[PDB]
């Protein structure tokens, strides 16, 4: 009847906590120094230990997850560390005088721009020619002549990315230090937030490839069983809707232009790589998506959309009516070049009750990713012909709202933030700290002696 | 000290266009959406659409879908609202609103022009 | 029959206490200025801080080498009034730690002062002759 | 009756020895290149180094789990000739640490050699049969 | 009679085991981003990690505070066939560590399982009444 | 004063002084003479504790 | 401290102390030149003669 | 000027080599071979230990 406290070391008790998670990658030996894997990251264990927790129900909230804000600040910090030692194109802001590279074509997306440039010597100046895209160049007079300048030279500085680093995303395992644990939600039918029935624990997350995408989520993890409609608030039109597929759709993108690399020295050791004459035909980049597969997959999505907007309702899909630059096009990197594909042909359907789709793509070289006002990167010309085949596994939609009496409902693609890309791979993970100390009364007392 | 300054009174012909300015001051312009609400003389409030200064992505209401074009200028911190093909009922006072600093969500217009 | 780290997290407090050895093992085990290197460096220091923190408390409680350790502190009824059958055969350590969370700071203060702060002096005087 | 950290600094050595758990608790517990981060990280590493330094000596002295530990080393009169009344009931640990500071190194050497360097070998030979 | 750090490296295992405290002591003890500061900080964490690594293994062996610790694991003849006189009075700890280096991982695995994984349950059941 | 922001490079913005709107008046500080004399006296009383 | 009855293998060619020291001297050189005056404008065409 | 950038050494720093001792951190030790006739590689009979070179 007399109760005394007793110390227990190793009690299964955890509490919600946010810590600094570190990197974990497999032994990928190789042309190296990719931004993400960088010089040295911790080698993943040969055999991961995923441990299921029986009769454990844990609350999850993918939208208030702290793992997303860490990863988002890790990608951005990795970008700047890989551009500090590279060549800055600050003198490349000379008044450009361009023409039409369009091979004597009557009735073009790139201009030919000749300019005066500095040399290895200071007193010596050279005149060189280089091909540029129309999207990276604006006229200098609008009065109008044919004199131009770079798009960034008026707002931000420009730095030429080093030609040795690759932008290919490799799997990244986010790992928790000792004393902390990650609770994985293994529920097949788990929506955004709420209690997860089947919960397990892991030390590191799975191989998350940091694929910087817009509208379309490429090279992502598929959802098991049925497709999932995740959103912070479905009743909110200002909140994006993350959709995860179950059957992966395929998308083939190529840059048929066989570009050439024209290295011109702009200073002692400073080598600016410009675009030489394209060998062969001028063909704009594009992407092919199977119309039979996309229509099939789109239909599987509207079946789950009606589970949140009435069993019978009008659901239509239109192109992005708001924004510019990269939020209105499916922007992504592929082999080094940054594509900007118009997805007007994908979101052009209306729902009630082998002939693939071609998507026009435009390519830039001066890009401004992650809201970075002040720093612009120059992608060096990728020599050769580019072809990459991706798995589109997710979408980022947005309602139009309005005073409609729930009769019709439109959906438009968007990409207002990059944190939404990482949430589609961190929705199931949750970081908690382990507290192995627990007191409990028993009928045992320490011997007085 | 959030300051929202709009343009002056406009007089346009039916079918013509009008662009309404909205210069912000006292906060980070690229961190909060910008809404647009009009009110006919003697009527109630009517939301038109919000625009994200970050990427420029907008969200026009279904009633004005295909007539209004909302743009922004980050250098001068000024959002714009242009309405094409003006009808007889478009006579109204056009306000630009902003969400609250608190609560981490929209739909609480504390600051108005 | 082993389930793994935190395997008996949903079990009763009596079934989970039989596998305290499981959670005890997985509780500790040109330029290096990479963001991952900084993260690894700060994670290793963070890991040994939480490990030595638990061993420090077990040291001042006289429970350094054991995993189940009895004490001199009598259980106050204001902390919890549940019966022995209602705790070890009805509640889990998760919901139990949430119930005693408001008194764990007071218990720890009495857990180190009532016994091992007193025992060492009594053991000094008992071994005086 | 607890006064707080360093509460018994001005008290007698006998009254201060009853509050050893007080000093024991408060003894251990885009870019992070900020001047304060470098300081904070270097302060945590410097802290855990000093903690394990003392615990290191408690290992070789056989006093790992206890706060008060009796030994086999006889006190030499050359270190201090005061009696138990003059030390424990008239002196503070501050002015006592100042009086033995010239011999603390010599005491430590015998404290690790005379006993636990000899006792463990005798423990092996006594438990040999 | 002390020779210094690693003084008994070439002596027999019987003469070297009497100086375990020697190697145990010297085992743990505008911008600071200089090449020497970053190396110094990473070396101090490396030092305390190697130290806690050995202390962790001595914790699962029940030998945390002792320098010479006897166990319940029987010595298999497949590890070495030499006699006690041929080991402690002919071999040094260097060449002895080379001979058993192929079995140290198997001994360590059995050292945690044969005793302290079994004793703690029996220690709980013997002190249960 | 007014801020006259002039761009001097790609992304580099130099902020110079514009024309002063209004009258030209040099900066100044005031301080109560009565309060300053009183505090000054309370100092010299303590200064004499070290100089006779 | 001399170690009697100890025979250790040495290999001056596979020594790691040399590879670290070589990286230390090189790293010290760049850090002592970063805050110094860079002579990038001193690339003007020189017109010289003989003494 | 045709190949690499150039940096003028500060006139305050000196290039005079001064003795540098390489030391080992805690838990590590440096073994010095004191053999007079010690060639490149091979076992060293007379072996001592130091903390710094
Ligand atoms: C999504 O995942 C796919 C598949 O993992 C990625 O495709 C990868 O594309 C790169 C770039 O072309 C391929 O590297 C290539 O290797 C050949 C040698 O055979 C070389 O000639 C090329 O110049 C290029 O270096 C890579 O092999 C390919 N992946 C695989 C597994 O073969 C794609 O880039 C990922 N990202 C996106 C946004 O789709
Ligand atoms: C872009 O302009 C450059 C001149 O700055 C062109 O280079 C020369 O063009 C002529 C024909 O106009 C050729 O005969 C030369 O062989 C070209 N090279 C040189 C080094 O002079 C270049 O052809 C232009 N490109 C396009 C597509 O119009
Ligand atoms: C893109 O253009 C390059 C440059 O001409 C092509 O590479 C040439 O291929 C031919 C094959 O008959 C070789 O004889 C040349 O020597 C290659 N060029 C160089 C500079 O060595 C390349 O083949 C083109 N791309 C593709 C996909 O064919
Ligand atoms: C989204 O689709 C609409 C479909 O109309 C595009 O708007 C058309 O753009 C062409 C190109 O100049 C014009 O000739 C048509 O008059 C436009 N139609 C309407 C109704 O405005 C729109 O351009 C597409 N979005 C983007 C970003 O291009
Ligand atoms: C400096 O400015 C402060 C402003 O508050 C002056 O203090 C005020 O003085 C007026 C004088 O009529 C009083 O009515 C207010 O009640 C005062 N307010 C406070 C907060 O003190 C102050 O006098 C000025 N400094 C000097 C030297 O006059
Ligand atoms: C040259 O390119 C401009 C850019 O659009 C185009 O308007 C013009 O028609 C082109 N020149 C000719 C002769 O077509
Ligand atoms: C280059 O310099 C010459 C001489 O001043 C000038 O005639 C020419 O227009 C310049 N070219 C450009 C592109 O500025
Ligand atoms: C998930 O479903 C539950 C059950 O209705 C609901 O309470 C919760 O808000 C949903 N979460 C999301 C993100 O839709
Ligand atoms: C695409 O999906 C298939 C099937 O899930 C998978 O085997 C393949 O590796 C995926 N490829 C990419 C690039 O994601
Ligand atoms: C993409 O290329 C692969 C090459 O194996 C082909 O099998 C697939 O059908 C292509 N898909 C599209 C949509 O072009
Ligand atoms: C999509 O599939 C439905 C169902 O068979 C069909 O009626 C419709 O025509 C298809 N649409 C397209 C664009 O293929
Ligand atoms: C959208 O779909 C309709 C119906 O098939 C088609 O006529 C129209 O051309 C499509 N839009 C575009 C821009 O091709
Ligand atoms: C889960 O519940 C079952 C059924 O009562 C029980 O046998 C099992 O031990 C429980 N496990 C945990 C971890 O709670
Ligand atoms: C019992 O608990 C109360 C409140 O926690 C405390 O004030 C009191 O001292 C305790 N009594 C004993 C005998 O532990
Ligand atoms: C303990 O159990 C008895 C039933 O045997 C019950 O009446 C009593 O209330 C319990 N004690 C509590 C709940 O504190
Ligand atoms: C300090 O000195 C006073 C003298 O009366 C004594 O009573 C007290 O115990 C001493 N220690 C304290 C106050 O900690
Ligand atoms: C105390 O130390 C002195 C000085 O080394 C020595 O002469 C004396 O014998 C020692 N006495 C005892 C009892 O240890
Ligand atoms: C103890 O030492 C003090 C001071 O040296 C002295 O006054 C006293 O007589 C000694 N003996 C006792 C029994 O206090
Ligand atoms: C310790 O040595 C110093 C230096 O000679 C001396 O001044 C001091 O009195 C000594 N203290 C003791 C307690 O012997
Ligand atoms: C030694 O190991 C072998 C192989 O497992 C085993 O058969 C034998 O019984 C062991 N002997 C002892 C004495 O442990
Ligand atoms: C033991 O390990 C050493 C390592 O060099 C190896 O040479 C030897 O063959 C091994 N012996 C056995 C029996 O495995
Ligand atoms: C300075 O002098 C110039 C001379 O033309 C005049 O135009 C200007 O208004 C004066 N003031 C400022 C603020 O520049
Ligand atoms: C300072 O004030 C005191 C008291 O008000 C007065 O006696 C003295 O004359 C004053 N001194 C000056 C310099 O005003
Ligand atoms: C150095 O001495 C060792 C002694 O064993 C010998 O094996 C080796 O060949 C010698 N090397 C040279 C280059 O003489």
Numbering used by the authors:
A (entry chain M): 32 to 61, 64 to 140, 152 to 186, 186A, 187 to 309, 312 to 321, 321A, 322 to 397, ...
B (entry chain N): 1 to 113
C (entry chain Z), D (entry chain Y), E (entry chain X): 518 to 546, 565 to 664
F (entry chain G): 302 to 309, 312 to 321, 321A, 322 to 354
G (entry chain E): 84 to 134
H (entry chain E): 196 to 248
The study reports:
VRC01-class bNAbs target the conserved CD4 binding site (CD4bs) epitope on the Env trimer and use the IGHV1-2∗02 gene segment in combination with a light chain (LC) bearing a short five amino acid LC complementarity determining region 3 loop. Most Env proteins do not engage VRC01-class bNAb precursors, unless specifically modified to do so. Therefore, we previously re-engineered the BG505 SOSIP trimer to specifically engage gl-VRC01 as well as V2-apex gl-precursors. To assess the activation of gl-CH31 B cells in vivo and to study the selection of indels typical of VRC01-class bNAbs, we designed a trimer that could engage gl-CH31, as the parental BG505 SOSIP GT1 does not engage gl-CH31.36 Accordingly, we introduced an N279D substitution that establishes an additional contact between GT1 and VRC01-class gl-bNAbs and named the resulting trimer GT1.2.
To confirm that the N279D substitution indeed allowed engagement of the conserved W100b, we determined the structure of GT1.2 in complex with VRC01-class precursor gl-PGV20 and PGT124 at 3.8 Å resolution. (D) Crystal structure of BG505 SOSIP.v4.1-GT1.2 (blue) trimer in complex with gl-PGV20 (orange) and PGT124 (cyan) Fabs at 3.8 Å resolution. The structure revealed an additional potential hydrogen bond between N279DGT1.2 and W100bgl-PGV20 as hypothesized, reinforcing the GT1.2/gl-PGV20 contacts, and, by inference, gl-CH31 contacts. (Right) Close-up view of the W100b hydrogen bond interactions of gl-PGV20 with N279 and N280 on GT1.2. The resulting trimer was well formed and remained in a closed, native-like prefusion conformation comparable with GT1 and other native-like HIV-1 trimers, as assessed by negative stain electron microscopy and gel electrophoresis. Moreover, the introduction of N279D preserved binding of GT1.2 to other gl-bNAbs such as gl-VRC01 (KD of 1200 nM) and gl-PGV19 (KD of 94 nM), thus effectively expanding the range of VRC01-class precursors that can be engaged with a single substitution. Moreover, its thermal denaturation was also highly comparable with that of GT1 and BG505 SOSIP.664 as evaluated by differential scanning calorimetry, with a melting temperature of 68.0°C.
